[PDB]
Nucleic acid binder design. Sequence first.
DNA 1: TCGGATGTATATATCTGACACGTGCCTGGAGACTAGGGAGTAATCCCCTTGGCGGTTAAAACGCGGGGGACAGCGCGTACGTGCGTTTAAGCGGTGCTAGAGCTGTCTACGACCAATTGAGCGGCCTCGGCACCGGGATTCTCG
DNA 2: CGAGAATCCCGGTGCCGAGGCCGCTCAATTGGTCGTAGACAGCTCTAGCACCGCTTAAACGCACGTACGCGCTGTCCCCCGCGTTTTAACCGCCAAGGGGATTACTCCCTAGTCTCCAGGCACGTGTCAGATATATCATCCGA
Lengths: 82, 78, 106, 104, 276, 98, 96, 92, 93
Amino acid sequence: KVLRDNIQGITKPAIRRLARRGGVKRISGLIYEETRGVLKVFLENVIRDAVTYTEHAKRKTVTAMDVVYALKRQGRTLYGFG
Amino acid sequence: DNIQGITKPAIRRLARRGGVKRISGLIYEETRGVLKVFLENVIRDAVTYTEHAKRKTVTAMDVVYALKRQGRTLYGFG
Amino acid sequence: AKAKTRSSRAGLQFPVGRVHRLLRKGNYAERVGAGAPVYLAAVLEYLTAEILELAGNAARDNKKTRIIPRHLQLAIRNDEELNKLLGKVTIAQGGVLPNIQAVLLP
Amino acid sequence: KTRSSRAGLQFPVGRVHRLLRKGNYAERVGAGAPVYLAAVLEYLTAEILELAGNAARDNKKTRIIPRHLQLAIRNDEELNKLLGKVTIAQGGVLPNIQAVLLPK
Amino acid sequence: ALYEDPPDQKTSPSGKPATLKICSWNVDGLRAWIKKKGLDWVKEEAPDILCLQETKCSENKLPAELQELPGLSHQYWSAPSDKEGYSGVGLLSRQCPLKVSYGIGDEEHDQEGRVIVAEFDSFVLVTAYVPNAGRGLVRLEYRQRWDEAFRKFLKGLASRKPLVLCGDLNVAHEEIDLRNPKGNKKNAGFTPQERQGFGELLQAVPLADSFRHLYPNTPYAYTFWTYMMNARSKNVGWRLDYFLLSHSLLPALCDSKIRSKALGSDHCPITLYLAL
Amino acid sequence: PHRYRPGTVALREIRRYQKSTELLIRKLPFQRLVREIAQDFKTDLRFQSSAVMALQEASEAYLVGLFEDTNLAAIHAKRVTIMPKDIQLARRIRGERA
Amino acid sequence: HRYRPGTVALREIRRYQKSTELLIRKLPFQRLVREIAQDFKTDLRFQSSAVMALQEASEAYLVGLFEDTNLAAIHAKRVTIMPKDIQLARRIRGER
Amino acid sequence: SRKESYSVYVYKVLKQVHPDTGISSKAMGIMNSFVNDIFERIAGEASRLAHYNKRSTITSREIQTAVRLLLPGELAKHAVSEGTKAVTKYTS
Amino acid sequence: SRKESYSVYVYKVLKQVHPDTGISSKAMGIMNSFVNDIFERIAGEASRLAHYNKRSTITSREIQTAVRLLLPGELAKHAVSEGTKAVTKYTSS
DNA sequence: TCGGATGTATATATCTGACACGTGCCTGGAGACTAGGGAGTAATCCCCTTGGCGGTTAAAACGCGGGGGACAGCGCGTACGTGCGTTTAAGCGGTGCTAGAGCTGTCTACGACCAATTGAGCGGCCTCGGCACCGGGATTCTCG
DNA sequence: CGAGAATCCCGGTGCCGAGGCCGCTCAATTGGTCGTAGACAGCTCTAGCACCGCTTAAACGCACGTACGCGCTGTCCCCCGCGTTTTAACCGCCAAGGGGATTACTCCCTAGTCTCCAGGCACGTGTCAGATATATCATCCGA
């Protein structure tokens, strides 16, 4: 089953809550459309490396370890998974 | 205090290559601190490398290693 | 003979033997010195003790006895030298340190 | 005879293989790994040198200097991604004046 | 913008066919021009006589492309003795001239490499690279003295057989002869002094401007375009290269062409058709 | 009847969501987004729940850092309202787009 | 007869962009490096290539910082570069 | 597949530092990853030092220099002091 | 004693791709540093890939995956294609 | 609208010191043969992911003031650039002089490596106490 | 300044996982050997440092004009706070199947060792690309 039009699933209130946690007080309307692209790009970059890692090991499930290594490649170094 | 050796025209010229048309009167005093901090950061690692190598001559390659550890990779000296 | 572990011999708490085994199997160099695992274990236990002490202080501040990732994340961010050692590291389910810019507050 | 000539390359294969073991990267090194890596390395500089001189021949010179390598790398759109962090000795800088600064 | 030179007229006003084709070209570095394969163009044009200016080449350094063309076999060359790499002129001819000489009176002492005189059966040919007034007019006074000397020299010649003068006369005579007249108010090539010199040349010798005689009101017709600012692309040029003729030769005049498309210099060739 | 002024609720909320440590993004939409992104590279993959949680946490950390940086940029320009050009500035100065 | 303020400044930017020179007097920089390194270890000997490498790295870092800060100042609807802009660029680059 | 994590050792260190403080499983995972990452950094820098100085073994001096390179500020000063004290006690 | 450098091979490649261009000594030193750095990056990534899978060999699979990981899109595709061509060329004879 | 101040495309004449090519030889690469240990293949099973159904409701979507902030426009006055005479220190050229970097010759200590062995550490199973929460009341902020 | 909303506190409840316990490991430790590497002494040449003198490019202090940074005002527009209506997330529940670890076996690829030679690195050297240096408009400012 193939999937379509899922980037809109990251709703406006979710962006508002993330921005509030970041510590902003007033948000312009054209921010939502910018972040749904920024996060898309970041996710595309991480998933490419994760899929490469899982494909090399001749696996078919993206283990959390693969995502951890993909993150570490770009200098993010998530702590708490494996 | 040879941070005074980095003269106002030299800072101005670095800014010009960076592409700045107008410079305020406080950058000259402010950028010397950034430069000093930056050097301290690379001079410490270079001296540590030399001290470990039990030499006392900070060779250029040690400086290259010191830059490479902080991400500022440098080509041309080895 | 009587058996005394190097972890006990050196007066540390981390296992010197496990560090030694990881150093050789890790392919870092074909020869491993005698004192290298001892030195490395001492440094590791020092750093762990420091971060755990700060986390415990933060937890006791919140009137909680247990240490949860939120406490580790405040302990890491509030200190300055730990923060630049772990500048490019994020703690899962750790939250963010509460600073709001003063311009925003009347 | 030489392995590089057998595989139709220019970069050495024996030297790469010697580095691959001496560098202590793994306990065993495969036979095809040096050839693959030598091919990749040759392709990379084939690309850098191909760009660098055009960037030299456009300026009426026949000799490549650091400036031409800096221009060729910065003008590219993915080679810049590959070499974003590196700094080339006296490589100068791309000529880029921001618009406001140019008086309209 | 632009200019298209009209088709070659090859018969005289009285209906006689052209028998003589002369091409003049400031090649601005003969060697370079040959590598710019300027001789391939010459072969296509197949002139009877070829006059070259600003060769910047002493005779010992002429490319072996010298012999390449059998038809132009009588060749005469001149270069300055103490300014090698500047000036230089040449004259190449299908038939052998009766007489050839160099300079305008004292070449043996002031070997300038600017002027060749060749006498043929029915006319005398002079080709010249007139001294530039220079950037900032630094050598304008010299140019004025030289113009006078040249006028007097040519007066003597024209006193016998009819004269054809061709080459780079380094002046745009009137406003119609360059794209930017006031833009060149005091610039070399368009000073009042140089323009007056050209007028006196026409009146004193006397001579007629072949191209302007045939095309008196035609603008945008140039023979030089500055290399800078791609002025050749934009047709921002000047008419600096001429064929000037004795009045007695006007009945022999078929056409005077500007070969705008021929590359290899910052000047283009000009070509004269005469019915002799 | 009683309505708060335009900044009070906004600040109550900075504080609550800067104090707490939940995920802040619904799990199912993010999982579907991750699956859709991953289908363009290798067909018929099978993610693990831990992997999706790790991706979620990394995304939240990245977005919060970006929002903090662009808020600093917006304050620098004598403004309180965050604008897209501020986000572009933050991304440019780090050196991500360019 | 003075050229207007925009004309000479950009005359300088274009020259200083194409040049690939060193732009900093070598002896003052060498003295500064020795003075700073005097602290960590006493009586050091600097190889000349080491000083040259330090100078190259310093020039690159300062030029990059000045670019990033010109963008910061330009965004604030201003052409003059101010110290607040440098401080903002440094904090954003995560270098503070 | 035993995993051999740094759980027991970290728990012992807490009990030493704070005698009456617990630690949850998520915090245990954070501490395990922290320890692994620091160990990897130190070992990698030690190997790089050995290779740079044409050496072939990792003596305690390489570890000391790696610690001095990685840890910023006073942390380096106290880490090297406690490490050398532990080594000195071990030798004798 | 002796210097191990890629000066000869980079000169040969330059001759092959540009038969009439020379290269100065500085640009030569930069092209040596570039090759050394790329070698370090790819070899380190291959070693790490081998370590993760509890495998003790650096074969063509680890190299190709590391090349795919490091290099950006078009460079990755072209490089892996050319490397596969070369390795098949070698194993054929 | 115009007079004066900067880019500015080709071409040739020297100086040079720095690339490009002989060259020779020695050192590392290449060819052969062997052992054996790592890796690929094969079968299994179980547990972990996928999918699908229903109920519940917290959260998202939408509409509507309205008020505060983004933005355009004017003014002003002070900071900066711009040119110029002056001084000052950086190059640049010797010149010497010694710390010490770099290489080589012993060999002794030191770490790799193998045969036992046992105890520190890991897996499965309680179990009671830390902690989230609801229920309620008291406390603090806030805007008209 | 006071009514109303948001927040902290006081406490009983029940829950689930943190911590302890016990059995069973398997790898860390002892005790030996043995090859080698790097510790140490010693030597030679190299280049880093200090000095001196001359040239002159550049840094500096100074006036002056002007332009742009910042403050202020007004306007309008658009984002927030709240209320009402979806609606899709979330929890629980189930089944199902496939693929990810496992053990056994085999085989073939590479490390190791040896001998032999050619290519590539240091060294010399003749040649000429690059650096000037001299000649031969068009366009864009300040007035």
